[PDB]
């Protein structure tokens, strides 16, 4: 069915499929000897596969996702491709499994009922890692198109990993009540133009999500009211307990002209300066 890539082929009999993670469909699995330095050791991985009644187009999209991940290469702040099963059975695409779920849920669960465990330098470090991940993806000509705290995964060691960059319906409200239009740069929403600078805008919204501990952007504003506010050049206010250093960066990400927004490289440098100063 598919060509053999000996660089990425992982033996399917060395995978123990487990619990479903989402719906292609994703399952948790145990892989033996995924690390060449540890030949028989188990690791927990995430495996993407086709549904039972998948079409030839669904196969194409999954193969395409796999190929893009191969080309992008490896980085500590992205969900990495670990292996593939293409021979003598169904197509499996094996990636890193982050134990602590998406960043939005990670932040919300740590809201204090009092001081929370996520102090200011931890929140800056979180933002810094996301910017480092985006800087890597940009250097690999990857435009995310939906960067948000829900699309960042958190490992057992609290390492931030950009998810779902290997590719949506912006107007459909998700089961968790997310409206993706709220992360769209104006040139993407109004003019269908997606660039690395439109991801910079989305990064600004993600910065706002971090400093509100997973708040929902433009709080209590319906989508129809959002369009008019964006046309007037309205921007979210400085949220509670957010210092001007961080709100200033959010405002820079939200400059109307994409050429006036900082680059992912400048955001990495700016967040590193904040972290060195406070810590
Ligand atoms: C690690 C065990 C575990 O149960 N973790 C869960 C806690 O939150 C949800 C889940 N963690 C998790 N970690 C990584 C995921 C990766 C993907 C994913 C896949 Cl399968 C592919 O396949 C090509 C591509 C991706 O991005 C390019 C991603 Cl992000 C995933 O779909 N899920 C659900 C993951 N879940």
PDB file of C-alpha atoms and ligand atoms in Angstrom:
ATOM      1  CA  UNK A   1       0.000   0.000   0.000  1.00  0.00           C
ATOM      2  CA  UNK A   2       2.644   2.613   1.036  1.00  0.00           C
ATOM      3  CA  UNK A   3       6.432   2.904   0.380  1.00  0.00           C
ATOM      4  CA  UNK A   4       8.919   1.762   3.034  1.00  0.00           C
ATOM      5  CA  UNK A   5      10.884   4.583   4.680  1.00  0.00           C
ATOM      6  CA  UNK A   6      13.558   2.694   6.706  1.00  0.00           C
ATOM      7  CA  UNK A   7      14.473   5.920   8.561  1.00  0.00           C
ATOM      8  CA  UNK A   8      10.978   6.099  10.165  1.00  0.00           C
ATOM      9  CA  UNK A   9       9.474   2.550  10.051  1.00  0.00           C
ATOM     10  CA  UNK A  10       8.736   1.185  13.528  1.00  0.00           C
ATOM     11  CA  UNK A  11       7.654  -2.515  13.931  1.00  0.00           C
ATOM     12  CA  UNK A  12       3.899  -2.563  14.657  1.00  0.00           C
ATOM     13  CA  UNK A  13       4.238  -5.704  16.903  1.00  0.00           C
ATOM     14  CA  UNK A  14       6.353  -3.502  19.262  1.00  0.00           C
ATOM     15  CA  UNK A  15       3.272  -1.263  19.878  1.00  0.00           C
ATOM     16  CA  UNK A  16       0.631  -2.093  22.534  1.00  0.00           C
ATOM     17  CA  UNK A  17      -2.483  -0.036  21.604  1.00  0.00           C
ATOM     18  CA  UNK A  18      -4.430   1.394  24.522  1.00  0.00           C
ATOM     19  CA  UNK A  19      -6.976   4.072  25.552  1.00  0.00           C
ATOM     20  CA  UNK A  20      -8.626   6.367  22.913  1.00  0.00           C
ATOM     21  CA  UNK A  21      -7.398  10.018  23.075  1.00  0.00           C
ATOM     22  CA  UNK A  22      -9.560  11.670  20.377  1.00  0.00           C
ATOM     23  CA  UNK A  23     -11.252  11.615  16.930  1.00  0.00           C
ATOM     24  CA  UNK A  24      -8.640  10.239  11.895  1.00  0.00           C
ATOM     25  CA  UNK A  25      -8.554   8.808  15.453  1.00  0.00           C
ATOM     26  CA  UNK A  26      -5.810   8.959  18.137  1.00  0.00           C
ATOM     27  CA  UNK A  27      -4.978   6.314  20.797  1.00  0.00           C
ATOM     28  CA  UNK A  28      -2.474   6.130  23.669  1.00  0.00           C
ATOM     29  CA  UNK A  29       0.057   3.281  23.240  1.00  0.00           C
ATOM     30  CA  UNK A  30       3.124   1.698  24.783  1.00  0.00           C
ATOM     31  CA  UNK A  31       6.111   1.380  22.393  1.00  0.00           C
ATOM     32  CA  UNK A  32       9.050  -0.949  23.102  1.00  0.00           C
ATOM     33  CA  UNK A  33      12.496   0.319  22.124  1.00  0.00           C
ATOM     34  CA  UNK A  34      11.460   3.658  20.542  1.00  0.00           C
ATOM     35  CA  UNK A  35      14.770   5.080  21.919  1.00  0.00           C
ATOM     36  CA  UNK A  36      17.792   3.428  20.146  1.00  0.00           C
ATOM     37  CA  UNK A  37      19.916   3.873  23.343  1.00  0.00           C
ATOM     38  CA  UNK A  38      17.254   1.841  25.362  1.00  0.00           C
ATOM     39  CA  UNK A  39      16.416  -1.191  23.067  1.00  0.00           C
ATOM     40  CA  UNK A  40      13.595  -2.925  25.045  1.00  0.00           C
ATOM     41  CA  UNK A  41      12.264  -0.101  27.236  1.00  0.00           C
ATOM     42  CA  UNK A  42       8.614   1.011  27.150  1.00  0.00           C
ATOM     43  CA  UNK A  43       7.538   4.589  26.408  1.00  0.00           C
ATOM     44  CA  UNK A  44       4.026   6.070  26.238  1.00  0.00           C
ATOM     45  CA  UNK A  45       3.231   7.434  22.780  1.00  0.00           C
ATOM     46  CA  UNK A  46       0.242   8.791  20.814  1.00  0.00           C
ATOM     47  CA  UNK A  47      -0.764   6.916  17.653  1.00  0.00           C
ATOM     48  CA  UNK A  48      -2.885   8.513  14.858  1.00  0.00           C
ATOM     49  CA  UNK A  49      -4.764   6.182  12.526  1.00  0.00           C
ATOM     50  CA  UNK A  50      -7.746   6.045  10.151  1.00  0.00           C
ATOM     51  CA  UNK A  51     -11.329   5.289  11.278  1.00  0.00           C
ATOM     52  CA  UNK A  52     -12.866   1.894  10.170  1.00  0.00           C
ATOM     53  CA  UNK A  53     -14.866   3.466   7.270  1.00  0.00           C
ATOM     54  CA  UNK A  54     -12.153   5.939   6.062  1.00  0.00           C
ATOM     55  CA  UNK A  55     -12.025   7.152   2.418  1.00  0.00           C
ATOM     56  CA  UNK A  56      -9.026   7.361   0.004  1.00  0.00           C
ATOM     57  CA  UNK A  57      -8.997  11.142   0.762  1.00  0.00           C
ATOM     58  CA  UNK A  58      -8.703  10.434   4.562  1.00  0.00           C
ATOM     59  CA  UNK A  59      -5.661   8.208   3.805  1.00  0.00           C
ATOM     60  CA  UNK A  60      -4.114  11.033   1.670  1.00  0.00           C
ATOM     61  CA  UNK A  61      -4.545  13.615   4.487  1.00  0.00           C
ATOM     62  CA  UNK A  62      -2.992  11.249   7.104  1.00  0.00           C
ATOM     63  CA  UNK A  63      -0.038  10.388   4.763  1.00  0.00           C
ATOM     64  CA  UNK A  64       0.335  14.174   4.106  1.00  0.00           C
ATOM     65  CA  UNK A  65       0.374  14.973   7.871  1.00  0.00           C
ATOM     66  CA  UNK A  66       3.083  12.273   8.365  1.00  0.00           C
ATOM     67  CA  UNK A  67       5.225  13.636   5.448  1.00  0.00           C
ATOM     68  CA  UNK A  68       5.040  17.261   6.703  1.00  0.00           C
ATOM     69  CA  UNK A  69       6.148  16.078  10.205  1.00  0.00           C
ATOM     70  CA  UNK A  70       9.115  14.204   8.641  1.00  0.00           C
ATOM     71  CA  UNK A  71      10.188  17.417   6.763  1.00  0.00           C
ATOM     72  CA  UNK A  72       9.717  19.839   9.723  1.00  0.00           C
ATOM     73  CA  UNK A  73      12.212  17.871  11.817  1.00  0.00           C
ATOM     74  CA  UNK A  74      12.676  17.721  15.571  1.00  0.00           C
ATOM     75  CA  UNK A  75      12.410  20.465  18.270  1.00  0.00           C
ATOM     76  CA  UNK A  76      11.966  20.286  22.084  1.00  0.00           C
ATOM     77  CA  UNK A  77       8.933  22.670  21.980  1.00  0.00           C
ATOM     78  CA  UNK A  78       6.881  20.819  19.289  1.00  0.00           C
ATOM     79  CA  UNK A  79       4.993  17.466  19.260  1.00  0.00           C
ATOM     80  CA  UNK A  80       7.533  15.269  17.455  1.00  0.00           C
ATOM     81  CA  UNK A  81       7.099  12.400  15.036  1.00  0.00           C
ATOM     82  CA  UNK A  82       8.674   9.266  16.577  1.00  0.00           C
ATOM     83  CA  UNK A  83       7.909   6.554  14.019  1.00  0.00           C
ATOM     84  CA  UNK A  84       5.403   5.193  11.495  1.00  0.00           C
ATOM     85  CA  UNK A  85       3.878   1.768  10.710  1.00  0.00           C
ATOM     86  CA  UNK A  86       3.173   1.614   6.933  1.00  0.00           C
ATOM     87  CA  UNK A  87       3.997  -2.051   6.159  1.00  0.00           C
ATOM     88  CA  UNK A  88       1.897  -5.256   6.601  1.00  0.00           C
ATOM     89  CA  UNK A  89      -1.133  -3.590   8.149  1.00  0.00           C
ATOM     90  CA  UNK A  90      -2.919  -0.286   8.881  1.00  0.00           C
ATOM     91  CA  UNK A  91      -1.176   3.101   8.728  1.00  0.00           C
ATOM     92  CA  UNK A  92      -0.045   4.326  12.147  1.00  0.00           C
ATOM     93  CA  UNK A  93       1.650   7.660  12.717  1.00  0.00           C
ATOM     94  CA  UNK A  94       3.463   7.647  16.075  1.00  0.00           C
ATOM     95  CA  UNK A  95       4.139  10.897  17.954  1.00  0.00           C
ATOM     96  CA  UNK A  96       5.152  12.079  21.477  1.00  0.00           C
ATOM     97  CA  UNK A  97       2.442  11.815  24.159  1.00  0.00           C
ATOM     98  CA  UNK A  98       2.228  14.803  26.576  1.00  0.00           C
ATOM     99  CA  UNK A  99       1.025  13.630  30.028  1.00  0.00           C
ATOM    100  CA  UNK A 100      -0.543  16.865  31.336  1.00  0.00           C
ATOM    101  CA  UNK A 101      -2.897  17.731  28.424  1.00  0.00           C
ATOM    102  CA  UNK A 102      -3.417  21.032  26.641  1.00  0.00           C
ATOM    103  CA  UNK A 103      -2.110  24.331  28.087  1.00  0.00           C
ATOM    104  CA  UNK A 104      -5.627  25.857  28.401  1.00  0.00           C
ATOM    105  CA  UNK A 105      -6.759  23.033  30.743  1.00  0.00           C
ATOM    106  CA  UNK A 106      -3.331  23.029  32.493  1.00  0.00           C
ATOM    107  CA  UNK A 107      -3.743  26.769  33.384  1.00  0.00           C
ATOM    108  CA  UNK A 108      -7.458  26.513  34.394  1.00  0.00           C
ATOM    109  CA  UNK A 109      -6.779  23.557  36.746  1.00  0.00           C
ATOM    110  CA  UNK A 110      -4.132  25.704  38.520  1.00  0.00           C
ATOM    111  CA  UNK A 111      -6.458  28.666  39.236  1.00  0.00           C
ATOM    112  CA  UNK A 112      -6.216  29.368  43.022  1.00  0.00           C
ATOM    113  CA  UNK A 113      -9.420  29.375  45.181  1.00  0.00           C
ATOM    114  CA  UNK A 114      -4.853  33.057  47.657  1.00  0.00           C
ATOM    115  CA  UNK A 115      -1.716  32.384  45.550  1.00  0.00           C
ATOM    116  CA  UNK A 116      -1.651  29.828  42.742  1.00  0.00           C
ATOM    117  CA  UNK A 117       1.304  27.508  41.973  1.00  0.00           C
ATOM    118  CA  UNK A 118       1.917  29.255  38.576  1.00  0.00           C
ATOM    119  CA  UNK A 119       3.927  32.274  39.720  1.00  0.00           C
ATOM    120  CA  UNK A 120       4.960  35.030  37.262  1.00  0.00           C
ATOM    121  CA  UNK A 121       8.370  33.460  36.156  1.00  0.00           C
ATOM    122  CA  UNK A 122       6.606  30.098  35.470  1.00  0.00           C
ATOM    123  CA  UNK A 123       4.014  31.886  33.268  1.00  0.00           C
ATOM    124  CA  UNK A 124       6.816  33.797  31.395  1.00  0.00           C
ATOM    125  CA  UNK A 125       8.742  30.500  30.961  1.00  0.00           C
ATOM    126  CA  UNK A 126       5.581  28.922  29.537  1.00  0.00           C
ATOM    127  CA  UNK A 127       5.228  31.808  27.007  1.00  0.00           C
ATOM    128  CA  UNK A 128       8.986  31.684  26.163  1.00  0.00           C
ATOM    129  CA  UNK A 129       8.816  27.921  25.278  1.00  0.00           C
ATOM    130  CA  UNK A 130       5.780  28.487  23.012  1.00  0.00           C
ATOM    131  CA  UNK A 131       7.622  31.331  21.217  1.00  0.00           C
ATOM    132  CA  UNK A 132      10.745  29.076  20.838  1.00  0.00           C
ATOM    133  CA  UNK A 133       8.513  26.350  19.309  1.00  0.00           C
ATOM    134  CA  UNK A 134       6.923  28.858  16.929  1.00  0.00           C
ATOM    135  CA  UNK A 135      10.362  30.297  16.003  1.00  0.00           C
ATOM    136  CA  UNK A 136      11.430  26.717  15.028  1.00  0.00           C
ATOM    137  CA  UNK A 137       8.250  26.064  12.979  1.00  0.00           C
ATOM    138  CA  UNK A 138       8.661  29.429  11.188  1.00  0.00           C
ATOM    139  CA  UNK A 139      12.303  28.513  10.242  1.00  0.00           C
ATOM    140  CA  UNK A 140      10.831  25.265   8.734  1.00  0.00           C
ATOM    141  CA  UNK A 141       8.272  27.350   6.687  1.00  0.00           C
ATOM    142  CA  UNK A 142       5.382  26.107   8.860  1.00  0.00           C
ATOM    143  CA  UNK A 143       2.410  28.518   9.266  1.00  0.00           C
ATOM    144  CA  UNK A 144       0.218  27.131  12.134  1.00  0.00           C
ATOM    145  CA  UNK A 145      -3.079  29.014  11.278  1.00  0.00           C
ATOM    146  CA  UNK A 146      -4.698  28.190  14.674  1.00  0.00           C
ATOM    147  CA  UNK A 147      -2.169  28.908  17.423  1.00  0.00           C
ATOM    148  CA  UNK A 148      -3.968  28.892  20.817  1.00  0.00           C
ATOM    149  CA  UNK A 149      -3.376  27.527  24.342  1.00  0.00           C
ATOM    150  CA  UNK A 150      -5.700  24.561  23.396  1.00  0.00           C
ATOM    151  CA  UNK A 151      -3.109  23.751  20.584  1.00  0.00           C
ATOM    152  CA  UNK A 152      -0.134  23.621  23.023  1.00  0.00           C
ATOM    153  CA  UNK A 153       0.432  20.359  24.974  1.00  0.00           C
ATOM    154  CA  UNK A 154       2.139  20.020  28.390  1.00  0.00           C
ATOM    155  CA  UNK A 155       4.539  17.130  29.191  1.00  0.00           C
ATOM    156  CA  UNK A 156       5.035  15.399  32.613  1.00  0.00           C
ATOM    157  CA  UNK A 157       8.047  17.807  32.999  1.00  0.00           C
ATOM    158  CA  UNK A 158       5.926  20.932  32.140  1.00  0.00           C
ATOM    159  CA  UNK A 159       7.630  21.330  28.720  1.00  0.00           C
ATOM    160  CA  UNK A 160       5.363  23.250  26.250  1.00  0.00           C
ATOM    161  CA  UNK A 161       4.863  21.513  22.900  1.00  0.00           C
ATOM    162  CA  UNK A 162       3.106  23.094  19.900  1.00  0.00           C
ATOM    163  CA  UNK A 163       0.448  20.697  18.628  1.00  0.00           C
ATOM    164  CA  UNK A 164      -1.489  20.260  15.363  1.00  0.00           C
ATOM    165  CA  UNK A 165       0.940  22.291  13.198  1.00  0.00           C
ATOM    166  CA  UNK A 166       1.105  19.480  10.542  1.00  0.00           C
ATOM    167  CA  UNK A 167      -2.100  20.492   8.653  1.00  0.00           C
ATOM    168  CA  UNK A 168     -10.154  24.353   9.793  1.00  0.00           C
ATOM    169  CA  UNK A 169     -13.697  25.655  10.487  1.00  0.00           C
ATOM    170  CA  UNK A 170     -13.081  28.962  12.320  1.00  0.00           C
ATOM    171  CA  UNK A 171     -16.810  29.699  12.756  1.00  0.00           C
ATOM    172  CA  UNK A 172     -17.787  26.439  14.463  1.00  0.00           C
ATOM    173  CA  UNK A 173     -17.968  26.697  18.283  1.00  0.00           C
ATOM    174  CA  UNK A 174     -16.206  23.622  19.752  1.00  0.00           C
ATOM    175  CA  UNK A 175     -17.758  21.256  22.393  1.00  0.00           C
ATOM    176  CA  UNK A 176     -15.642  23.143  25.005  1.00  0.00           C
ATOM    177  CA  UNK A 177     -17.149  26.442  23.738  1.00  0.00           C
ATOM    178  CA  UNK A 178     -14.072  27.638  21.818  1.00  0.00           C
ATOM    179  CA  UNK A 179     -14.675  30.060  18.897  1.00  0.00           C
ATOM    180  CA  UNK A 180     -11.445  29.953  16.754  1.00  0.00           C
ATOM    181  CA  UNK A 181     -12.262  33.300  14.996  1.00  0.00           C
ATOM    182  CA  UNK A 182     -11.167  34.962  18.345  1.00  0.00           C
ATOM    183  CA  UNK A 183      -7.480  33.954  17.614  1.00  0.00           C
ATOM    184  CA  UNK A 184      -7.480  35.061  13.942  1.00  0.00           C
ATOM    185  CA  UNK A 185      -5.372  38.015  12.796  1.00  0.00           C
ATOM    186  CA  UNK A 186      -7.585  40.645  11.056  1.00  0.00           C
ATOM    187  CA  UNK A 187      -5.934  39.964   7.665  1.00  0.00           C
ATOM    188  CA  UNK A 188      -6.729  36.228   8.117  1.00  0.00           C
ATOM    189  CA  UNK A 189     -10.383  36.801   9.303  1.00  0.00           C
ATOM    190  CA  UNK A 190     -11.278  39.642   6.886  1.00  0.00           C
ATOM    191  CA  UNK A 191      -8.900  38.970   3.936  1.00  0.00           C
ATOM    192  CA  UNK A 192      -7.997  35.168   3.940  1.00  0.00           C
ATOM    193  CA  UNK A 193      -4.234  36.065   4.260  1.00  0.00           C
ATOM    194  CA  UNK A 194      -2.228  33.654   6.510  1.00  0.00           C
ATOM    195  CA  UNK A 195       1.491  34.281   7.210  1.00  0.00           C
ATOM    196  CA  UNK A 196       3.976  33.877  10.049  1.00  0.00           C
ATOM    197  CA  UNK A 197       2.900  37.420  11.106  1.00  0.00           C
ATOM    198  CA  UNK A 198      -0.750  36.260  11.399  1.00  0.00           C
ATOM    199  CA  UNK A 199       0.527  33.506  13.804  1.00  0.00           C
ATOM    200  CA  UNK A 200       2.249  36.379  15.753  1.00  0.00           C
ATOM    201  CA  UNK A 201      -1.221  37.892  16.306  1.00  0.00           C
ATOM    202  CA  UNK A 202      -2.555  34.484  17.552  1.00  0.00           C
ATOM    203  CA  UNK A 203       0.524  34.299  19.841  1.00  0.00           C
ATOM    204  CA  UNK A 204      -0.588  37.604  21.428  1.00  0.00           C
ATOM    205  CA  UNK A 205      -4.005  36.049  22.185  1.00  0.00           C
ATOM    206  CA  UNK A 206      -2.199  32.959  23.587  1.00  0.00           C
ATOM    207  CA  UNK A 207      -0.091  35.355  25.811  1.00  0.00           C
ATOM    208  CA  UNK A 208      -3.409  36.804  27.064  1.00  0.00           C
ATOM    209  CA  UNK A 209      -4.689  33.181  27.751  1.00  0.00           C
ATOM    210  CA  UNK A 210      -1.526  32.482  29.829  1.00  0.00           C
ATOM    211  CA  UNK A 211      -1.775  35.669  31.958  1.00  0.00           C
ATOM    212  CA  UNK A 212      -5.538  35.070  32.637  1.00  0.00           C
ATOM    213  CA  UNK A 213      -4.826  31.378  33.562  1.00  0.00           C
ATOM    214  CA  UNK A 214      -6.861  30.125  30.576  1.00  0.00           C
ATOM    215  CA  UNK A 215      -9.417  32.925  30.274  1.00  0.00           C
ATOM    216  CA  UNK A 216     -11.509  33.021  27.087  1.00  0.00           C
ATOM    217  CA  UNK A 217     -10.488  35.939  24.799  1.00  0.00           C
ATOM    218  CA  UNK A 218     -12.692  39.060  24.457  1.00  0.00           C
ATOM    219  CA  UNK A 219     -14.540  37.879  27.648  1.00  0.00           C
ATOM    220  CA  UNK A 220     -18.337  37.974  27.378  1.00  0.00           C
ATOM    221  CA  UNK A 221     -18.310  39.514  23.857  1.00  0.00           C
ATOM    222  CA  UNK A 222     -20.402  37.710  21.150  1.00  0.00           C
ATOM    223  CA  UNK A 223     -18.730  37.008  17.737  1.00  0.00           C
ATOM    224  CA  UNK A 224     -20.957  39.579  15.876  1.00  0.00           C
ATOM    225  CA  UNK A 225     -19.826  42.286  18.378  1.00  0.00           C
ATOM    226  CA  UNK A 226     -16.166  41.080  17.893  1.00  0.00           C
ATOM    227  CA  UNK A 227     -16.208  41.963  14.143  1.00  0.00           C
ATOM    228  CA  UNK A 228     -17.223  45.616  14.779  1.00  0.00           C
ATOM    229  CA  UNK A 229     -14.699  45.985  17.622  1.00  0.00           C
ATOM    230  CA  UNK A 230     -11.916  44.677  15.320  1.00  0.00           C
ATOM    231  CA  UNK A 231     -12.960  47.114  12.524  1.00  0.00           C
ATOM    232  CA  UNK A 232     -12.705  50.025  15.060  1.00  0.00           C
ATOM    233  CA  UNK A 233      -9.271  48.727  16.167  1.00  0.00           C
ATOM    234  CA  UNK A 234     -10.442  47.642  19.657  1.00  0.00           C
ATOM    235  CA  UNK A 235      -7.957  45.564  21.683  1.00  0.00           C
ATOM    236  CA  UNK A 236      -8.368  43.639  24.954  1.00  0.00           C
ATOM    237  CA  UNK A 237      -7.532  45.606  28.130  1.00  0.00           C
ATOM    238  CA  UNK A 238      -4.536  44.828  30.374  1.00  0.00           C
ATOM    239  CA  UNK A 239      -5.866  41.857  32.433  1.00  0.00           C
ATOM    240  CA  UNK A 240      -5.645  41.726  36.298  1.00  0.00           C
ATOM    241  CA  UNK A 241      -2.137  41.093  37.785  1.00  0.00           C
ATOM    242  CA  UNK A 242      -0.545  41.323  34.261  1.00  0.00           C
ATOM    243  CA  UNK A 243       2.554  43.621  34.237  1.00  0.00           C
ATOM    244  CA  UNK A 244       3.027  46.280  31.473  1.00  0.00           C
ATOM    245  CA  UNK A 245       6.069  44.297  30.112  1.00  0.00           C
ATOM    246  CA  UNK A 246       3.745  41.435  29.118  1.00  0.00           C
ATOM    247  CA  UNK A 247       0.712  43.510  28.048  1.00  0.00           C
ATOM    248  CA  UNK A 248       3.097  45.629  25.922  1.00  0.00           C
ATOM    249  CA  UNK A 249       4.185  42.450  24.075  1.00  0.00           C
ATOM    250  CA  UNK A 250       0.484  41.475  23.564  1.00  0.00           C
ATOM    251  CA  UNK A 251      -0.164  44.977  22.113  1.00  0.00           C
ATOM    252  CA  UNK A 252       2.854  44.604  19.752  1.00  0.00           C
ATOM    253  CA  UNK A 253       1.492  41.202  18.518  1.00  0.00           C
ATOM    254  CA  UNK A 254      -1.843  42.980  17.867  1.00  0.00           C
ATOM    255  CA  UNK A 255      -0.533  45.845  15.699  1.00  0.00           C
ATOM    256  CA  UNK A 256      -2.990  46.191  12.731  1.00  0.00           C
ATOM    257  CA  UNK A 257      -0.128  46.120  10.173  1.00  0.00           C
ATOM    258  CA  UNK A 258       1.537  42.643  10.050  1.00  0.00           C
ATOM    259  CA  UNK A 259       4.960  44.299   9.301  1.00  0.00           C
ATOM    260  CA  UNK A 260       4.692  46.230  12.637  1.00  0.00           C
ATOM    261  CA  UNK A 261       4.277  43.039  14.751  1.00  0.00           C
ATOM    262  CA  UNK A 262       7.448  41.540  16.289  1.00  0.00           C
ATOM    263  CA  UNK A 263       8.912  38.349  14.783  1.00  0.00           C
ATOM    264  CA  UNK A 264       8.964  35.040  16.755  1.00  0.00           C
ATOM    265  CA  UNK A 265      12.752  35.641  17.150  1.00  0.00           C
ATOM    266  CA  UNK A 266      12.087  39.089  18.775  1.00  0.00           C
ATOM    267  CA  UNK A 267       9.392  37.586  21.086  1.00  0.00           C
ATOM    268  CA  UNK A 268      11.862  34.861  22.225  1.00  0.00           C
ATOM    269  CA  UNK A 269      14.466  37.575  22.997  1.00  0.00           C
ATOM    270  CA  UNK A 270      11.888  39.851  24.759  1.00  0.00           C
ATOM    271  CA  UNK A 271      10.492  37.035  26.979  1.00  0.00           C
ATOM    272  CA  UNK A 272      14.038  35.898  27.837  1.00  0.00           C
ATOM    273  CA  UNK A 273      14.824  39.492  29.014  1.00  0.00           C
ATOM    274  CA  UNK A 274      11.707  39.511  31.268  1.00  0.00           C
ATOM    275  CA  UNK A 275      12.658  36.078  32.733  1.00  0.00           C
ATOM    276  CA  UNK A 276      16.316  37.128  33.494  1.00  0.00           C
ATOM    277  CA  UNK A 277      15.073  40.384  35.173  1.00  0.00           C
ATOM    278  CA  UNK A 278      12.398  38.832  37.472  1.00  0.00           C
ATOM    279  CA  UNK A 279      14.239  35.564  38.265  1.00  0.00           C
TER     280      UNK A 279
HETATM  281  C1  LIG B   1       0.771  10.710  27.143  1.00  0.00           C
HETATM  282  C2  LIG B   1      -0.481   9.952  27.622  1.00  0.00           C
HETATM  283  C3  LIG B   1      -1.858  10.658  27.579  1.00  0.00           C
HETATM  284  O1  LIG B   1      -2.874  10.009  27.820  1.00  0.00           O
HETATM  285  N1  LIG B   1      -1.883  11.976  27.287  1.00  0.00           N
HETATM  286  C4  LIG B   1      -3.170  12.700  27.142  1.00  0.00           C
HETATM  287  C5  LIG B   1      -3.300  13.910  28.061  1.00  0.00           C
HETATM  288  O2  LIG B   1      -3.806  14.992  27.210  1.00  0.00           O
HETATM  289  C6  LIG B   1      -4.282  14.393  25.979  1.00  0.00           C
HETATM  290  C7  LIG B   1      -3.288  13.275  25.748  1.00  0.00           C
HETATM  291  N2  LIG B   1      -1.977  13.825  25.327  1.00  0.00           N
HETATM  292  C8  LIG B   1      -1.585  13.906  24.052  1.00  0.00           C
HETATM  293  N3  LIG B   1      -0.277  14.077  23.755  1.00  0.00           N
HETATM  294  C9  LIG B   1       0.142  14.165  22.414  1.00  0.00           C
HETATM  295  C10 LIG B   1      -0.835  14.136  21.426  1.00  0.00           C
HETATM  296  C11 LIG B   1      -0.481  14.215  20.088  1.00  0.00           C
HETATM  297  C12 LIG B   1      -1.491  14.259  19.126  1.00  0.00           C
HETATM  298  C13 LIG B   1      -1.078  14.473  17.802  1.00  0.00           C
HETATM  299  C14 LIG B   1      -1.038  13.426  16.882  1.00  0.00           C
HETATM  300 CL1  LIG B   1      -1.547  11.846  17.342  1.00  0.00          CL
HETATM  301  C15 LIG B   1      -0.500  13.639  15.612  1.00  0.00           C
HETATM  302  O3  LIG B   1      -0.482  12.537  14.786  1.00  0.00           O
HETATM  303  C16 LIG B   1       0.194  12.765  13.520  1.00  0.00           C
HETATM  304  C17 LIG B   1      -0.072  14.915  15.223  1.00  0.00           C
HETATM  305  C18 LIG B   1      -0.065  15.959  16.153  1.00  0.00           C
HETATM  306  O4  LIG B   1       0.353  17.256  15.922  1.00  0.00           O
HETATM  307  C19 LIG B   1       1.148  17.529  14.761  1.00  0.00           C
HETATM  308  C20 LIG B   1      -0.603  15.747  17.414  1.00  0.00           C
HETATM  309 CL2  LIG B   1      -0.605  17.088  18.469  1.00  0.00          CL
HETATM  310  C21 LIG B   1      -2.838  14.132  19.523  1.00  0.00           C
HETATM  311  O5  LIG B   1      -3.740  14.098  18.683  1.00  0.00           O
HETATM  312  N4  LIG B   1      -3.158  13.991  20.839  1.00  0.00           N
HETATM  313  C22 LIG B   1      -4.596  13.820  21.262  1.00  0.00           C
HETATM  314  C23 LIG B   1      -2.185  13.988  21.779  1.00  0.00           C
HETATM  315  N5  LIG B   1      -2.506  13.864  23.077  1.00  0.00           N
END
